[PDB]
Design a protein around this ligand. Structure first.
Ligand SMILES: Nc1ncnc2c1ncn2[C@@H]1O[C@H](COP(=O)(O)OP(=O)(O)O)[C@@H](O)[C@H]1O
Lengths: 561, 37, 63, 450, 450, 145, 144, 145
């Protein structure tokens, strides 16, 4: 009765269980039928369990067993190309017991080791897997396998004369993997999307919320990031699936390609589905299973992206479990406990100095789906308070065909300064100044349009008409991007700054021409403008040539006066 | 034009009237269901 | 006219099901007036106590 | 095994069993009733008592009344012969014909068959309506809601698609599943007459749930319909189109019982589980394994109080591949169909368009029309602000384009437009704009198609 | 004395004691755990059972598990040696140094010492920021909130004041108490590094509460901070400046438990007790008995959803002597610090300015700059209406003054400006205006300072 | 349906009337059923429900009302009576929101069922335009019918 | 707020309503009765030959219509300016002032229905006779 | 009535004061009762009510406030004290709306009771017109009295 128990009663969604004396609060438990549940209430004479599935498959007297985890997960060769679920298992084992991996010794007998130290290498999947001493294990390597082929269960090394080490290890998904120090946000997570990388930077190991109404393009930002972001591994928790969003990803993503290599994106991905037929328990645990797997890959020295479809649905699954447990409902009937929990999740994000040195990171991008535009509780409200970044897809920007549909007035980062140096050193010295200048343009346009809404546009001076002219070019020629075009579907960093300088250079020239009494109507029909408008479609630097083409054309306007 | 802002201003305040006060008979009704239960 | 066929088959197909049932019920209705009926009656009542219920008693016609 | 009612409150009935408790979801039968009265087990309360939900009225029930456990949930009498019949929400005949002769008896919750493939929706469904086929193409496996409001002809559109839909040269047979929920007797008589007169009934299964039918029967209606669709698609390899009106009425019934079930209400009085029950319906669509068949949904979502932000219509948007949003304001201007051209969208749209599917210029034309219509609609606001005469020549063209889009592209005089016909109208209206203002159409397409 | 868990729901644990009940606020220790697990008593339920709140996760707890009463809460280990140390919300070391060696052990609710005098706040605190010192002067004993919103650099301002603040020739020593609530690990590492590098740490006590620290520890954080401030001010005669960021985050935690406590929610889902808990924090400020020391507060109030009418920021206004309100709109125009010049008030400014505090011309200069900047901003509208060239010569000067105010007075290249420096910049920009147009500066000040 | 009458009686009044209405149409008569009003019937029903401790929702109305009200209006229609012959029951229901709000109960649920709405407009009335029916806000789904 | 549930539910219990308005009171018009929001439900049962006078309904209808038009024209004056108003509209604008100054305003004073109809006809003379749509010709000839 | 004081004490403060005020008028003195302010007293009362779980209404204030506030102002007046002699309690109450809105609590309910209102006008003050009392928006229903 310490490790197992027997159902006392079931109905009203809670299973009351006799025994399970050693179960932890919030541990997954297993019913004989194969369903899983979460230990919610520990009482003196029972355990109350939330069932992650249909309770008619549970009867009084049924056997219940501990799993021992908030955890666990297997972490070794065989993770790549693999497809698991909420609790890691082929879409049952986790890591192939038969598959043979080429182990390469990276330590000699007599070496002193500590948790996180690399003792061997396995080309399981190029990627090169790095075999590490499990956290909390140190001493002297007394025995170590030679370069050969072995299955996971085999022992490759012994430490302190008997702890035995394998190629894999287990870890409680609920407990964030140890590290020496979490490095302050310093390195940008190069997205390749100009608006993001420029105006609303995400830092490697940053938490940046994705929020907005249904059908605004939230998931799409995530999917493009995975297809092109500078993370080696992606952990997609494709939650809030419905109608066919499950089969939409089931046989689809297995075909999506890795733009970087031209191989399947799944070859560097881990999918965690959260369908409606699944218990609130499983979907609740899905972010924790994912984050743990994410932390596992960053431990190797990889930069991983954790994309959470979404937390609104996770909080609804949690509210269902809480109400069934009779916990007191608050705002929108959500339990009091949610804010601290959600925060605790996002806190596990960050770029760290892994056990045994080396740097890795987990960047989180979470989808926000309020009950309907209200943008309050659960999701949005609590999330936007944690996350450092928010990319606001705007349905009005979308209807206007301005892509990406990210509102440059309502979005914020908190990563702009964090990533500016990467851009300045690797792309362009004037990245930050350019995006600040464009944003001030857009900011000024917003103010001007508000006034025009009142007093009309007839009183507008030439100076104000020029600002609207250039503001419009920024929106149409820069902000808007065509995801369906073979070229503009992705905009390399080098192309993003070059297009920015063509626009900003046209601005300076525009304001300079006006100051010299050039009719704005003359500038508005300037021939180069139509070329600037199609610049996003050019795949060659022929784009920076537009700067000189702009200057001479203005000269032809300085000539005619 | 200060006609716009004028009577049309009456506009915004019957509009605003209508619901920070209506939206409230309500945050509070639902309280009221299991607020009362 | 295509509907005019399907329904005429449906009426026919019905009539046959409704006659297969007519017979199946005639069999059971005239079942008590033959042997092997006692072995049937007891075996029914067996499951009544053999199933979930604890024991007590049962009832039937006076025949 | 038999139980006895220990409590009755509206649709919720508690039932105590001395031997063998019925598992959650089992159908129980109340003894001593003139008409069959089903109780669906919802919970195990403890003390050998279960909590249930009635499928019909509970007036006349007494404490101690007997109940038997049927040993299983409710189910669909599955057969290809489902085609040509009109049934209730529970699959009982409404056409005076005999009960279905099942080839298989299927559970209806979505667990049966595991039919779906992990492949994207693709290929054309010709609705015969130009504003769908041309501009917002319906694709096989997609969920494309009709977004409307009270007073609008959403049901006329739903019925017209049911009559007209086909899958133009497909090797696979085509079928329609039409399910109506909480409709009047007059509406039921109308739908029946329409299917019978047109001969649309030959390739359709129709489920009709009346306003006065049990609330539980309404909840089961969409599940009977989706199970029939999945059976025809997976076991018979058919492209099946499922039309569900009205999801908002389904929601009013599900919401009606949430209170009797003891839950703390969520926003607007709705059930806290609104999105995870609704997900059980929108998850059921897409290509089926084998890729011979597919299940497509056209759910009708009426705005309660015309509010598209109400939790019901708002949560439905994510379940769709195409949305057609109807607007009362537009209907009051005499524009029918009353489609809001700046709030109707196509999702999985990119998977069903281009060379070898529709035509190479389809995406460019769709993008340009959407952009020009959105600008034109904003300019209607600007006209109101400044006056018509103060609008620039360029803006006047975009203003006029919005009227042209509404008059000629949105409006169809009932009429089955091919995608070629729809693209032609699109290019004709686009001519109103300066060629220099076609930012979203590559020059290759302008030269070839303008 | 020992008890046994009788119930566990997330962070709330019920514990029954057979002998001696632990009083509310006592820290209890759960037996049988790998890491220390504290339960803080919150209520006496009756029947020898208390209701508690856990300071760490409750996974793995079992009914019947043993618990001991430590005989006390948490408490403040008070000593002058608190200066130079970085601690958690509960006053435990975060700087790898030894635990505080208490001179006295003080309760933290505000009952200890009874330190406050019934005297008005007075005399200058030089923040080194011109927009505070010159126009909205902070005074010793005042509560002057920073009013901001998400995305704005309110924490940069808070940290800068912590580095720069002093009490210019005072016979009394000066100290800072900096408390952060619900911050990230990255933010905590940044704050630590900043205090250590600048040498600001020498005259400061720092309390850092992380987002993942127990919610109860966050609630206790401002109380640890205020108790340390009152101790230093009253028992050591110091002028102490307390900086609390962010009160809104404190409120999110207090609100989080109100639900678990069984209360009917108030507006916006908040605790019904919002204003009488918040009053326990804003009441703790002012001159202390003896008039050698004082406690001043600079609380940060971020607008949730940028809404200054949300009950949290709205109830905080009454607790302040000076308010600095930051605006996203202003920040988006590139004006930093992003202070709304028409919503920032010396709710108590007049009590901290003038001869013997700042300088005699401070009020006049502040009034004139505010008036000229407001006129200049309106003229930006007039320029848009009529054109730049149609503006009068006099209006053009006011238009230009608004740019000068923004470029030179608002903008600081990070930089600790004395009030003398800030008044000098103010007079320099004022020269742009005609002397005949300085309606709000008496002639005595023009002759002496212009 | 007076105020001194139990909520029960007023609740049953529309059902007693509709049944009498259906009775006359059975003879082959076209009858008009005029319901003063359903706002007050829903208030009488909310009183009974709250006394029965049924869970209050929006404006404290029970969840059960929408299906019931719809079921009422569904009994309207022109039929082919038992033994041939045609008859009909046309329903005209009054709508009285708590006060201009025009939300719940009455209006909201009703305007969703009914096919016709004749909006008397107080501003049209003050202007002495009779009948005071707003030709911009009224609708008959029945125009084509 | 006349739409508050209390005053709004009270309207159905009345046979005559007299609605007072703050705006009108602030213009110094007392009693501060809104002439386009005061009604009589059972009014037709207490008027006409043998009760008041045969022209009572016609006069009441015409004054109500003219006052309502005149009040709307106060809005139109604000929109376009006084000088841009047509000659016909100017008469209706002026009639609204006459109705308020002479008919609504009483210097405390017990007016017989004959006195009240006389004032009504006197103010009606301000309108073109061709614009008296709600008074049958029989009454114009006999009473105008 | 400081902020560190319970909502209870501040709530009772006007009643303790009025009683002391009535006590002095009993002697035959004319006393002035100046109430800084009732907006804060209604906020302290709303805190107590919400903690008691009483149903929130407009601005989340309890229903009970209007009758109470009126009952307070009713205790004002010039009387013929016990054993003859005349005395009086004149009340001057401060009004502080949440912020210019001038609705609930304070203003709205108060301006309905009080017979006099002296409207300090911030625009009159900025213009240096003292006392800053708006002679157009202020009123005393006592002029004729
Ligand atoms: N960047 C984009 N470019 C073009 N279309 C887009 C883009 N983002 C979204 N859309 C359109 O909007 C639809 C909804 O986007 P999606 O990301 O799935 O919504 P959600 O916010 O619900 O996750 C997409 O299927 C597509 O039709």
């Amino acid at each position: 009765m310490i490790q197992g128990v027997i159902q006392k009663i079931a109905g009203p969604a809670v299973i009351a269980k006799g025994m399970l004396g050693a179960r932890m609060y919030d541990i997954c438990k297993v019913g004989e039928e194969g369903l899983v549940g979460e230990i919610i209430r520990l009482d003196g004479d029972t355990a109350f369990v939330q069932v992650y599935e249909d309770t008619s498959g549970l009867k009084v007297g049924e056997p219940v067993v501990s799993t021992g985890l908030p955890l666990a997960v297997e972490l070794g060769p065989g993770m790549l190309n693999g497809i698991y679920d909420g609790i890691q298992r082929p879409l049952v084992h986790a890591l192939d017991r038969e598959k043979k991996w080429a182990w390469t010794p990276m330590v000699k007998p007599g070496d002193e080791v500590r948790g996180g130290m690399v003792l061997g290498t396995v080309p399981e999947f190029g990627f090169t897997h790095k075999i590490l001493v499990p956290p909390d294990v140190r001493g002297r390597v007394k025995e170590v396998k030679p370069a050969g082929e072995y299955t996971v269960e085999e022992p490759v090394v012994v430490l302190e004369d008997g702890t035995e080490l394998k190629m894999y290890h287990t870890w409680p998904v609920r407990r964030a993997r140890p590290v020496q120090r979490k490095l302050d946000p310093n390195t940008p997570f190069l997205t390749g999307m100009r608006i993001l990388d420029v105006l609303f930077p995400v830092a490697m190991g940053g938490t940046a919320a994705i929020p907005g109404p249904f059908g605004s393009g939230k998931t799409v930002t995530q999917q493009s990031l995975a297809k092109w972001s500078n993370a080696d591994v992606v952990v997609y928790v494709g939650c809030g699936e419905r109608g066919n969003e499950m089969t939409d990803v089931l046989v689809e993503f297995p075909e999506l390609t890795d733009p970087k290599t031209g191989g399947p994106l799944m070859h560097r991905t881990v999918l965690i589905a959260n369908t409606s037929n699944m218990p609130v328990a499983a979907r609740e645990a899905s972010i924790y299973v994912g984050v743990t797997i994410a932390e596992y890959f960053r431990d190797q020295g990889f930069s991983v992206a954790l994309m959470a479809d979404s937390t609104s649905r996770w909080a609804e699954a949690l509210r269902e479990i809480s109400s069934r447990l009779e916990e007191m409902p608050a705002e929108e009937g959500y339990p009091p406990y949610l804010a601290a929990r959600l925060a605790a999740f996002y806190e596990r994000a960050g770029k760290v100095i892994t056990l045994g040195g080396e740097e890795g990171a987990v960047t989180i991008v979470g989808a926000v789906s309020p009950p309907g535009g209200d943008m309050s509780e659960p999701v949005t409200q609590s999330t936007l308070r944690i996350v450092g970044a928010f990319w606001r897809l705007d349905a009005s920007l979308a209807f206007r065909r301005h892509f990406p549909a990210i509102n440059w007035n309502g979005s914020y980062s908190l990563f702009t300064s964090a990533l500016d140096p990467w851009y300045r050193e690797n792309v362009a010295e004037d990245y930050p100044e350019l995006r600040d200048a464009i944003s001030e343009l857009l900011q000024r346009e917003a103010g001007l349009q508000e006034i025009v809404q009142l007093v009309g546009p007839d009183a507008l001076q030439d100076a104000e008409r020029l600002v609207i002219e250039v503001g419009r070019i920024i929106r149409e020629d820069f902000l808007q991007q065509n995801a369906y075009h073979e070229v503009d579907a992705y905009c390399s960093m080098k192309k993003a700054y070059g297009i920015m300088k063509m626009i900003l250079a046209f601005y300076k020239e525009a304001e300079a021409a006006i100051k010299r009494g050039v009719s704005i109507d003359e500038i508005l029909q300037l021939p180069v403008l139509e070329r600037i408008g199609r610049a996003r479609y050019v795949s060659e630097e022929e784009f920076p040539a537009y700067f000189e083409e702009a200057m001479k054309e203005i000269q032809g306007a300085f000539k005619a006066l | 034009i200060p006609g716009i802002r004028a009577q049309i201003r009456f506009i915004q305040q019957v509009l605003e009237q209508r619901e920070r006060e209506d939206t409230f008979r309500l945050k509070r009704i639902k309280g009221k269901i299991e607020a009362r239960e | 006219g295509e509907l005019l066929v399907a329904t005429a088959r449906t009426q026919a197909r019905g009539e046959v099901l409704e006659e297969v049932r007519r017979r199946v019920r005639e069999a059971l209705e005239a079942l008590p007036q033959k042997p092997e009926w006692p072995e049937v009656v007891r075996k029914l009542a067996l499951e009544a106590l053999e199933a979930l219920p604890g024991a007590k008693a049962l009832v039937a016609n006076p025949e | 095994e038999y139980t006895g009612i220990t409590y009755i409150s509206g649709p919720l009935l508690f039932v105590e069993n001395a031997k063998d408790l019925a598992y959650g979801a089992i159908v129980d039968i109340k003894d001593g009733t003139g008409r069959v009265r089903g109780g669906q087990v919802i919970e195990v309360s403890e003390e050998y008592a279960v909590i249930q939900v009635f499928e019909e009225t509970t007036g006349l029930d007494l404490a101690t009344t007997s109940v038997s456990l049927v040993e299983d949930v409710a189910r669909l009498g599955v057969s290809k012969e489902m085609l040509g019949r009109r049934f209730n929400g529970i699959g009982k005949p409404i056409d005076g014909l005999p009960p279905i002769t099942p080839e298989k008896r299927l559970p209806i919750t979505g667990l049966p068959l595991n039919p779906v493939a992990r492949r994207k929706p693709e290929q054309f469904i010709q609705t015969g309506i130009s504003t769908i086929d041309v501009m917002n193409t319906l694709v096989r496996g997609q969920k494309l809601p009709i977004f409307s409001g009270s007073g609008l002809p959403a049901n006329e559109i739903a019925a017209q698609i049911a009559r007209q839909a086909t899958v133009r040269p497909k090797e696979e047979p085509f079928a329609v599943v039409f399910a109506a929920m909480g409709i009047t007797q007059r509406e039921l008589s109308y739908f029946i007459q329409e299917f019978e007169r047109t001969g649309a009934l030959s390739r359709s299964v129709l489920f009709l749930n009346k306003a006065d039918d049990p609330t539980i029967e309404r909840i089961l209606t969409p599940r009977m319909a989706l199970t029939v669709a999945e059976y025809l698609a997976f076991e018979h390899d058919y492209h099946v189109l499922v039309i569900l009106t009205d999801m908002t009425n389904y929601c009013e019934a599900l919401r009606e019982i949430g209170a009797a079930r003891e839950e703390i209400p969520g926003r607007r009085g709705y059930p806290g589980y609104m999105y995870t029950d609704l997900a059980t319906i929108y998850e059921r669509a897409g290509v089926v394994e084998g890729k011979k068949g597919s299940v497509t949904q056209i759910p009708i979502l009426s705005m309660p109080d015309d509010d598209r932000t109400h939790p019901i219509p708002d949560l439905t948007g994510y379940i769709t591949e195409g949305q057609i949003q109807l607007s009362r304001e537009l209907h009051r201007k005499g524009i029918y169909p009353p489609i809001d051209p700046l709030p109707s969208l196509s999702r999985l749209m990119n998977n069903g368009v281009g060379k070898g599917k529709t035509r190479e210029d389809h995406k460019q034309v769709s993008d340009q029309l959407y952009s020009a219509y959105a600008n034109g609609v904003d300019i209607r606001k600007l006209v109101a602000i400044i006056g018509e005469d103060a609008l620039t020549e360029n803006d006047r063209r975009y203003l006029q384009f919005a009227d042209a889009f509404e008059r000629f592209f949105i409006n169809q005089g009932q009429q089955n437009r091919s995608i070629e016909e729809s693209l032609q109208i699109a290019w004709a209206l686009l001519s109103m704009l300066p060629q220099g203002e076609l930012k979203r159409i590559s020059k290759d397409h302008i030269g070839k198609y303008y």
